[PDB]
């Protein structure tokens, strides 16, 4: 078999937990919404738990390698990811060959702890041309998708400034861009190996027009 998508009932704590994590990390972006659209609340249409035997094996297999190199601590973490490649990701997993080379920290796979940051990328860099059907970045109609993943960070190379890497720095397994006055408002997590992230949950949703 391949990937199985398990519907989480909205009355379930698991579903409830994901949503609150998603709804609760919304924030104002210095962009003004141009990228991800104006809203301060989402409408969750549904959340499905991605199940894939092979994807799990590679992630887990990679998980203990990082542990070997990080004092038996893989330092896992739940983070959001958004891009126009979600449907491929939940079937084939994260593949760094499709990593974003224009990234702040190099050709890696980017995650955020603020659902609103990943939302800016759902339709492409800087929001691209908005939704496929209406070509609107702030569309309140079309259904969007972002992931809430398990991310194996291992030993993270902490950095403030832009520095494009192809791979994690020696002895490290990830890069954490930290907030800087003339820099990042908020932190972003980067990995250079796809199998160090599992696309746990697939959230289908809509941003909501203000009140
Ligand atoms: O990470 C990015 C850039 C967009 C992005 N940037 C951020 C920057 C700071 C904080 C959070 C984010 C973020 O959520 N997304 N894009 C991206 C695009 C595709 C991938 C990908 N991984 N596997 C595939 C794949 C696999 C099989 C077939 C086709 C594609 O694509 C990974 C990352
Ligand atoms: Zn639309």
Swiss-Prot record:
Family: Belongs to the ARTD/PARP family.
Localization per record: Cytoplasm; Golgi apparatus membrane; Cytoplasm, Cytoskeleton, Microtubule organizing center, Centrosome; Nucleus, Nuclear pore complex
Range of the intact protein held here: 1104 to 1314 of 1327
Reported function: Poly-ADP-ribosyltransferase involved in various processes such as Wnt signaling pathway, telomere length and vesicle trafficking. Acts as an activator of the Wnt signaling pathway by mediating poly-ADP-ribosylation (PARsylation) of AXIN1 and AXIN2, 2 key components of the beta-catenin destruction complex: poly-ADP-ribosylated target proteins are recognized by RNF146, which mediates their ubiquitination and subsequent degradation. Also mediates PARsylation of BLZF1 and CASC3, followed by recruitment of RNF146 and subsequent ubiquitination.
Subunit details: Oligomerizes and associates with TNKS2. Interacts with the cytoplasmic domain of LNPEP/Otase in SLC2A4/GLUT4-vesicles. Binds to the N-terminus of telomeric TERF1 via the ANK repeats. Found in a complex with POT1; TERF1 and TINF2. Interacts with AXIN1. Interacts with AXIN2. Interacts with BLZF1 and CASC3. Interacts with NUMA1.
Name of the protein in its database record: Poly [ADP-ribose] polymerase tankyrase-1
Native organism: Homo sapiens (Human)
Tissues/organs with expression: Ubiquitous; highest levels in testis.
Post-translational modification: Phosphorylated on serine residues by MAPK kinases upon insulin stimulation. Phosphorylated during mitosis.
Domain of life, per lineage: Eukaryota
Location of the PARP catalytic domain: 9-211
Residues annotated as binding Zn(2+): 131, 134, 139, 142
């Amino acid at each position: 078999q391949g990937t199985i998508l398990l519907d989480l009932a909205p009355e379930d704590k698991e579903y409830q937990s994901v949503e609150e994590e998603m709804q609760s990390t919304i924030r104002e972006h210095r962009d003004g919404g141009n990228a991800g659209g104006i809203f301060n609340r989402y409408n969750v249409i549904r959340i499905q738990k991605v199940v894939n035997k092979k994807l799990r094996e590679r992630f887990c297999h990679r998980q203990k390698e990082v542990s070997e190199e990080n004092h038996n601590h893989h330092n896992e973490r739940m983070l959001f990811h958004g891009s126009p490649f979600i449907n491929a990701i939940i079937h084939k997993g994260f593949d760094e060959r499709h990593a974003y080379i224009g990234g702040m920290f190099g050709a890696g796979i980017y995650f955020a702890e603020n659902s609103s940051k990943s939302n800016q990328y759902v339709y492409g860099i800087g929001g691209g041309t908005g939704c496929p059907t209406h070509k609107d970045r702030s569309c309140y109609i079309c259904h969007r998708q972002m992931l809430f993943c398990r991310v194996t960070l291992g030993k993270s190379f902490l950095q403030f400034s832009t520095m494009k890497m192809a791979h994690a720095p020696p002895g490290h397994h990830s890069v954490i861009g930290r907030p800087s006055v003339n820099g990042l408002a908020y932190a972003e997590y980067v990995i250079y190996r796809g199998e160090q992230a599992y696309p746990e949950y697939l959230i289908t949703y809509q941003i909501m027009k203000p009140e």
